[PDB]
Amino acid sequence: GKKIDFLLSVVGFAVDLANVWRFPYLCYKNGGGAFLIPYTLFLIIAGMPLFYMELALGQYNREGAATVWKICPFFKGVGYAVILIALYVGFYYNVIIAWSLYYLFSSFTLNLPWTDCGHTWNSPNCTDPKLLYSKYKFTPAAEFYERGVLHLHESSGIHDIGLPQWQLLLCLMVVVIVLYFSLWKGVKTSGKVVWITATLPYFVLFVLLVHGVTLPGASNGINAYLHIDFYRLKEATVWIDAATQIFFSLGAGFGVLIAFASYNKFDNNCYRDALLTSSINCITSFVSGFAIFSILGYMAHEHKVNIEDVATEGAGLVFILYPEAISTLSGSTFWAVVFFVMLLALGLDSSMGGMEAVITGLADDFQVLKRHRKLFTFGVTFSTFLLALFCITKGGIYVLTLLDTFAAGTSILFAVLMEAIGVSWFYGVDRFSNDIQQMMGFRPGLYWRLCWKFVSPAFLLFVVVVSIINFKPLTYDDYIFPPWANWVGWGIALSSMVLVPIYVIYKFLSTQGSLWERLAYGITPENEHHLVAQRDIRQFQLQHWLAI
Ligand SMILES: O=C(C[n+]1ccc2ccccc2c1)c1ccccc1
Numbered sequence: 016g017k018k019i020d021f022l023l024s025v026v027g028f029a030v031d032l033a034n035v036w037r038f039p040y041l042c043y044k045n046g047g048g049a050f051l052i053p054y055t056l057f058l059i060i061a062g063m064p065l066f067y068m069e070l071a072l073g074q075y076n077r078e079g080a081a082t083v084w085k086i087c088p089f090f091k092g093v094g095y096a097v098i099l100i101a102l103y104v105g106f107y108y109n110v111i112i113a114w115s116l117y118y119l120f121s122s123f124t125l126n127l128p129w130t131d132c133g134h135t136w137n138s139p140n141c142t143d144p145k146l147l148y149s150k151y152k153f154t155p156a157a158e159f160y161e162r163g164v165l166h167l168h169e170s171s172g173i174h175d176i177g178l179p180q181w182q183l184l185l186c187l188m189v190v191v192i193v194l195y196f197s198l199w200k201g202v203k204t205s206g207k208v209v210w211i212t213a214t215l216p217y218f219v220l221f222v223l224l225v226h227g228v229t230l231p232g233a234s235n236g237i238n239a240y241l242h243i244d245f246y247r248l249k250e251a252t253v254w255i256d257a258a259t260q261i262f263f264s265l266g267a268g269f270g271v272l273i274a275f276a277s278y279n280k281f282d283n284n285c286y287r288d289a290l291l292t293s294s295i296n297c298i299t300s301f302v303s304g305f306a307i308f309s310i311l312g313y314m315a316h317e318h319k320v321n322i323e324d325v326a327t328e329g330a331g332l333v334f335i336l337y338p339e340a341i342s343t344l345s346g347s348t349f350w351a352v353v354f355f356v357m358l359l360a361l362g363l364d365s366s367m368g369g370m371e372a373v374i375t376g377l378a379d380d381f382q383v384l385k386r387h388r389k390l391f392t393f394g395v396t397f398s399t400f401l402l403a404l405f406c407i408t409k410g411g412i413y414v415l416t417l418l419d420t421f422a423a424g425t426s427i428l429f430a431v432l433m434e435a436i437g438v439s440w441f442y443g444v445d446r447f448s449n450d451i452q453q454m455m456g457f458r459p460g461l462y463w464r465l466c467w468k469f470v471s472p473a474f475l476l477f478v479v480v481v482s483i484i485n486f487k488p489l490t491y492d493d494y495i496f497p498p499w500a501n502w503v504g505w506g507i508a509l510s511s512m513v514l515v516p517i518y519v520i521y522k523f524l525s526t527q528g529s530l531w532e533r534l535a536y537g538i539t540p541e542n543e544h545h546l547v548a549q550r551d552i553r554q555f556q557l558q559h560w561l562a563i
């Protein structure tokens with residue numbers, strides 16, 4: 016039974032709410048098949064090596080995101096930046112969980128609310144196929160999502176967001192309460208409910224893939240998926256999206272892996288962990304795009320619109336697609352309950368780790384917070400609840416879009432780039448390899464060291480530069496955000512990107528001694544500062560820098 020338990024642990028570790036909710040609309044937006052060449056390339060080249068590096072860092076140092084930089088004291092700012100990014104994401108992550116819970120509540124009926132026209136939320140333009148370049152939004156399912164759930168029709172833009180929706184308010188309160196009462200005792204929340212939180216996503220994917228293929232218009236969707244538009248690969252938006260999605264789904268750049276692995280057995284094998292997680296992620300993504308495009312090809316056939324106009328490209332694509340596939344199944348109520356229970360469980364499970372990253376990273380930094388976990392968890396959870404309250408208004412989809420685009424984009428890419436720099440170049444890839452050898456019994460191979468030192472930082476810097484210089488103003492499918500919205504988003508990105516130089520400056524000024532002594536204290540591990548008085552700093556020799 017241990018092998019069954021081991022398989023469940025690995026397979027449930029590999030799946031995340033990002034894979035299920037954020038990949039579909041990123042694949043639809045960037046053409047489908049053309050989105051997986053950058054996706055797989057960046058996976059192989061930067062996602063697997065960096066996942067491995069973060070796992071090994073956390074496991075060896077037994078420290079959270081912030082304090083793990085005792086190995087090079089100038090990068091505690093990088094730690095703080097990743098904690099801030101993880102805090103920012105939860106604001107709207109919990110809002111998606113609230114949407115899932117509202118849909119689950121709506122699903123306990125024999126006449127599902129998203130199948131036909133004529134409800135209190137329907138407009139005069141509602142078009143049911145059964146009875147009877149701009150995106151198509153007059154379908155029963157899209158109108159349900161945008162009028163009976165979001166109540167978006169009561170907003171004009173990000174300048175008139177409105178007041179909180181009380182239904183989503185109650186759902187968000189339930190979600191927040193569950194998260195707190197799951198996080199207030201301790202970190203350990205594995206092996207107790209993962210039997211359903213690990214197998215249900217894959218069962219849902221399997222039934223969706225087997226069914227959608229047998230739909231009237233699925234062939235056209237699969238063709239649009241498998242036809243690769245090589246012109247999209249010269250635009251840099253697909254590359255930016257693929258990089259950000261790799262880091263979103265693998266957990267890198269959020270401080271989640273470091274905090275999670277600080278609890279692993281010292282001898283735990285991180286090589287196999289990275290290999291298995293990345294392989295499962297790649298196969299799952301390539302198989303999930305198939306089902307997405309089969310569903311929306313059938314939607315194109317049924318609604319008689321072009322496959323590039325059937326559905327939104329925003330955060331609600333899954334909530335538009337899953338209902339459409341559900342209504343085509345027999346016993347649609349049972350299937351709706353299964354799908355939305357899966358979504359709710361997966362979202363709660365992943366948001367728990369996202370919040371535990373913040374709690375652990377900041378508690379390992381201050382002992383007062385480590386002795387008072389109940390109050391700290393309350394504070395984190397309540398601040399998240401309010402700043403998400405901002406996202407459940409009438410025009411809260413615009414704020415969720417602004418956050419989704421700016422909270423972890425260039426900011427997360429920069430943070431992970433600085434992590435790779437600080438470890439590989441300053442701490443030493445050779446010392447990092449020695450630590451991995453002491454932990455796991457074998458030294459990392461040449462491919463891993465090359466990716467850690469040269470290849471991954473090079474591509475991360477390329478993507479960061481391109482994202483900064485090739486930046487498209489913000490939109491939601493028909494709506495052009497006012498310029499001050501992009502300025503606000505760039506301020507949000509800089510708010511976490513800038514913690515690095517500020518901490519470097521603070522550390523330099525707070526230290527005592529001469530310039531060279533200050534640099535030596537700044538780039539030397541905290542438990543080797545007594546060598547500085549001996550004027551033996553390895554970073555001050557060319558040999559340390561020419562290593563591989
Ligand atoms: O990234 C996450 C949750 N997450 C995603 C992917 C993972 C992969 C492996 C291990 C843990 C993981 C956790 C998050 C959630 C809410 C706020 C901020 C960050």
Ligand SMILES: [Cl-]
Nearest residue numbers: 034038264300
């Ligand atoms: Cl993904």
